[PDB]
Amino acid sequence: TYTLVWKVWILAVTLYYAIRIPLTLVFPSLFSPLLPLDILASLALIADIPLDLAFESRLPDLLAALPLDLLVFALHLPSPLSLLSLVRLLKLISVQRSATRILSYRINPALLRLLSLVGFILLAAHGIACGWMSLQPPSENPAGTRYLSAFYWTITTLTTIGYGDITPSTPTQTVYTIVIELLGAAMYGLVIGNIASLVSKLDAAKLLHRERVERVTAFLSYKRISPELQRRIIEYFDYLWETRRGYEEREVLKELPHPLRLAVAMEIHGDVIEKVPLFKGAGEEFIRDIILHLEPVIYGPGEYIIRAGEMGSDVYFINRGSVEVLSADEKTRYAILSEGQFFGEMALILRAPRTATVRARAFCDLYRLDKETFDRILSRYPEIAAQIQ
Amino acid sequence: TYTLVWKVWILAVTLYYAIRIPLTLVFPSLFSPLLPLDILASLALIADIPLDLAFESRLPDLLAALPLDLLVFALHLPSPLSLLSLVRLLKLISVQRSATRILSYRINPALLRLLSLVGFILLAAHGIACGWMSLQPPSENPAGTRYLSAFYWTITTLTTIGYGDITPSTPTQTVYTIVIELLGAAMYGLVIGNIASLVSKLDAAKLLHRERVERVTAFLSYKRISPELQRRIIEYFDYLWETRRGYEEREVLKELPHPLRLAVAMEIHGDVIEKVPLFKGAGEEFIRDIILHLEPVIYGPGEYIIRAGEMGSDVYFINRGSVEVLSADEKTRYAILSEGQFFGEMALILRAPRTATVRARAFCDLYRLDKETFDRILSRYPEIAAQIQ
Amino acid sequence: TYTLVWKVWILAVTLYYAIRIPLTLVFPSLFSPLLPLDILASLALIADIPLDLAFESRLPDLLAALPLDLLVFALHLPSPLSLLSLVRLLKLISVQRSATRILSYRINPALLRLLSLVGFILLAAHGIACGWMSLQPPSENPAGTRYLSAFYWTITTLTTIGYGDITPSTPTQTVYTIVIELLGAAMYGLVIGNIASLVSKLDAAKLLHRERVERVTAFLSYKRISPELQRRIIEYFDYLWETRRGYEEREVLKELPHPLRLAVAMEIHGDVIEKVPLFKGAGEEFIRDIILHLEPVIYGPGEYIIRAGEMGSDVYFINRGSVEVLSADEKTRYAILSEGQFFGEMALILRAPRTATVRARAFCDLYRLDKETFDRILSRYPEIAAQIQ
Amino acid sequence: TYTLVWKVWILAVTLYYAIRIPLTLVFPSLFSPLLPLDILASLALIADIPLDLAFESRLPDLLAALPLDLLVFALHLPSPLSLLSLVRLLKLISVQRSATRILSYRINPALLRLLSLVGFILLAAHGIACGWMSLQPPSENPAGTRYLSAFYWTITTLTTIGYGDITPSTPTQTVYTIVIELLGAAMYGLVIGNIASLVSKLDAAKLLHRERVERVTAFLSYKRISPELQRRIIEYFDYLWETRRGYEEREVLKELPHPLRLAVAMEIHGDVIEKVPLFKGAGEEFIRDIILHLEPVIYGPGEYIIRAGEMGSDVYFINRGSVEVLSADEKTRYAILSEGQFFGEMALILRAPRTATVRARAFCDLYRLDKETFDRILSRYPEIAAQIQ
């Protein structure tokens, strides 16, 4: 758990190198003031190059391990022989790999890639400003002012803005500006593509539900469906989006493995069947088997779950909604059933027409178990089929 | 239902603050002329900060509740001590959250996010123009003209255009222009990504049908399918796209819950089975059970639904098309069947070869019920199996 | 079929209006030279406004029907009272709707939307150049040269390039340039989004096959699969992509309706079962029923379809590949089977171990029919079960 | 295998032509110095135009075959009559087609299209620089310097940067700059769209797993699932992503054909059933049949695979994890089972309650075979049902 601070320190030291080595390349009078920090960074990299193998393609790390920057700056080598100090930025590839490895589970990978690209773009802009120094004619200008001008020019170039108040004056400056132009176009396209990918998946669930509703309502309007049924279906879809975020229970449950799905079924509806008087005198295997076959169904307000006098082969367990039960002819209210309650128990023990109708008060979700699955389950458990009969 | 006008008023007051507080920061001679509106806005925010809890992360609302802007403007504090008045824009986050909460169901969420980003970009452009005032050297220029120049510069920057006729002249102006450059690149990328996400889902159904047709025709061309069958399949796909928008009936129906699917089946084909002479003397449960197993099939023009003399185990209910019936050898036209009619009733009561052939005149859609599902349904209802036999 | 030329003429006349009315607004000395074309266009629009109801939201058409442009130009009304002539561009909305309606089936809808946006952008650029005339100070410059300058400026603005050699000089010019800046950013974002949507679906099948291969090979590498089996699976996937474009036969077939799927099965494998000696003395219903249950399987080179001495319950019909049959111990080659041939016929008439092994020479695709479906089919046709026994 | 070097040579020769013919159009004093290379390229194209038919829409190849460039340059034809030499770039279309044909399987097609577009954009930029020469006024400037200026201008235009330090001065230059402006906007939009398409599919598997986890956890949080079960499910999903990259075994296996799936089952679990004492004295057909019905299930740490005293109808084969077995009441550890081992063998030979419980130590993956599939398999093989009983 203590490797996170070490990785953060590696981030800090590699950013310090990325900001320092091109500035020191530009200004030779910068090696000595930051010499202690430079040697500290070098020894940190040396001590980190074996530490990567502990608690874990490695060519960039090896290239950025040995200190080329110290030799070229101490010897005051010319620019072609000092451009080899730029190998310290090979640490950035391994840093980005480690960052994607450590915090991918906590941060959206598209957003993480976008922030990594933004940081790399800022570092590249600093490097391009330093390169702009390398070709700008010498002048009696403060280092801060000329760095501000170079950073302004490179930020104008990368963002494809092109004010034109800072333009090349020498052929080498023109070649460098063409290269930076192409690089800035490439990274601006990368930024826009990353933003587009992030945005297109920002509301994936909402868009999925929207197209789900649109296709259903278009199909219904083709089939000449009355506005009442259309409004009821739209209200059901709105309730589904507001409660389950438009996710069907069956699709989510089947995507889980057998033991996790069994535990989920336990926690969702084990109490509601534990209240059930019929299923006592039975082992936990029978309970798990019957609740693994509970098919959820959502009933809107004013909908008839069943009709009295009809055959009936289903048993319903209320999960989160509230539902009312009326008489056979639906004049008087027998009782009120809420979460944790169940009805239709008479259908399991006897094959006779139902006694009373039950209608949903509001949007209620309940689990329906047909007689086929119940008979299949009790067939595997003859000892349970005795007392129920 | 009266909270919509209150939310609209909150929108208006927060936009007024967003347009006012930076302008008043720029021009000190603006606090007094808009003092009544300022105090009205302040009292509206104070009265709204408890109203959010009624009829419903809250840190921005609390930050934007108390009036920092009134204190700094009355005391004429310097710019570093008056930048704290910008906390009133924390109301914008809650405003955007409320806007996404209230009208997401009525407006495409991608388009809603795009418009919200456009409005925020306009407000940010106004703020950036005000900041451009804050660093522009003082001059004897009208407020309108200098605001027009600043807004022109910031709109040029944000849209990544960069005319260059308005460029920084001071180092602080250069730093501010770099910051605004990065911000404008970021928001232009955001705009382009939002537009790309909106466009990619503009014709999701049409693109789905297009790739559906393309894969089918490529597979058929691989299998050496004659141009006649290819043209017939293409015509069927065109009819499907023009009627059902390329949506299969089974996929749409199975995506609905059991009661809503039952009601949809009711409205689609309850009349066509109510005409059916065979199914009278039966309860509504049997009707719902049989029509819940009706598998829709689309028959193109000139296609043979069945052949006379063949065994036959299907019954078809015309839904929206028109179909013709010929003789066994197909010389004479027996009759014409249209929407609401049905044929194949003889197969349900007797297992004998069919008497006559039936061929589709135009593109007709009808529901086919095989003998297996019918026998399964009537087995559950022995009382219905009596009169049918 | 003669409405296509009329729609093309409407396209030409509305483009002529879009290019003419702003130019004539800019140059008052342009109404008379194009007066015959103007009145011809007006009468064409008048005669077309009832023709839309024949052989087929209509508010833009009604607005663009009556000739506001003729009145304002003849009366030489000022700019605020002549801006009402721009209602003729309301014809563009109906033109775009008709274009999307007529040729959506022949041209990729994303590409069609991109071209429509490009044309609208060109027309808008012409209009913006005309507006640039409307605010440019009067000068002794040729109309062609000033139009070229205005079009250059507007094309620079819309493409977010911003050279800056043409910049506003008056406050009204600055406001117009800000508006055109925002519009150009919006339409450039629209162009980029349309291009991104078009590109993301350019290789949908290829990308689907690529991710299909990648997930399979990653899962196999996780399960420690030898390089031989990995190479065989990669070769099979390459063959599948090169022949069927990565589309599984079952997925394509099940996406078709029952009669079209039956006809496809007819054309694919009716000859190969017509050669089959066992299935003669049988009606076409039995043939269609058995071939509707043919499950396709792809066998790579060197793969064992079955093994001699094993029980065996499958019959295979070669479709497009070439396959060889060896002895029971696989020393001698019994024969060579090609497209249109079949083997495994002994398993249908007798439940005994197979006599010889059969191995694929090259990548061969054949249809496998297990004994379960065959027994189910022949059970429905007892008259066919006689001679086969 | 020797056609790859020929295709590379064609690439080199067509790039040489693309860089040469516009430069020679600009500078008439360039035909003679590169005459041997020109005639070598011409003869290479002539010898390649029949070679395309060997070891394989052809109109561009025929157009670019015959040497129009040699005639116009030798005759020193004017620009309108020498623009016909640009037909040599028709070779680029066939080159791109061949490149997409040869290395699509080895390189991501989106990335390949992006690189092809980048190369075409560089060639077009060179051509646009040459066209900029064609309209630039003659001056005593070195060819290198003026080419650098033209390339700088065209790169500024295409990347939508627009510095403005190089602007048109003549009407023809203005028209050319407008055309290049539109072309640069189009290709920049193409680059951004290609980058967006590449990025959106960079982490398709990771994004799929992320949305899989998000929908599951949202559904569970809706159903009031305790943080313990939520954490267990999150840990299982993390393990699944880290091992199988979030791919379910069933989905991957069913996407393979029957023989390849059979071979995969062989290699995955043939040894673990070869250790099994019960299944000896059985043929390979029975082994393949039983292992083709092995349903994989993933059990997290601390999870109960079965419970002692319960009926039990499953047999589990450990594949990659490690699992422990305890007593019936779970006080003592019976043994330790690892990869290649199996338990639950008693359920196959006798229908009695299980003797001991088995719980997973760490995340273990094992294949569960229920009694239904085993009974179905052994029913087809009566000779195997003897010794097992």
Ligand SMILES: Nc1ncnc2c1ncn2[C@@H]1O[C@@H]2COP(=O)(O)O[C@H]2[C@H]1O
């Ligand atoms: N007053 C009530 N309280 C609780 N449950 C009831 C009441 N009336 C009817 N039910 C249930 O509703 C069912 C409808 O008919 P059943 O025969 O299935 O058995 C009935 C009971 O399970």
Ligand SMILES: Nc1ncnc2c1ncn2[C@@H]1O[C@@H]2COP(=O)(O)O[C@H]2[C@H]1O
């Ligand atoms: N003239 C007709 N009018 C209506 N239906 C018919 C006519 N002729 C045949 N049919 C139907 O077409 C069916 C074809 O053969 P069946 O034996 O299934 O029973 C037949 C009737 O259901």
Ligand SMILES: Nc1ncnc2c1ncn2[C@@H]1O[C@@H]2COP(=O)(O)O[C@H]2[C@H]1O
């Ligand atoms: N020489 C051959 N020519 C054609 N088919 C053959 C030949 N030898 C074997 N077969 C087929 O291969 C099958 C393998 O064993 P069966 O008993 O299924 O019946 C066999 C025949 O159908």
Ligand SMILES: Nc1ncnc2c1ncn2[C@@H]1O[C@@H]2COP(=O)(O)O[C@H]2[C@H]1O
């Ligand atoms: N000590 C052990 N070593 C290996 N396997 C065991 C051990 N104890 C129990 N099992 C297995 O675990 C199973 C649990 O109950 P069964 O009756 O299915 O048969 C048991 C054996 O297959």
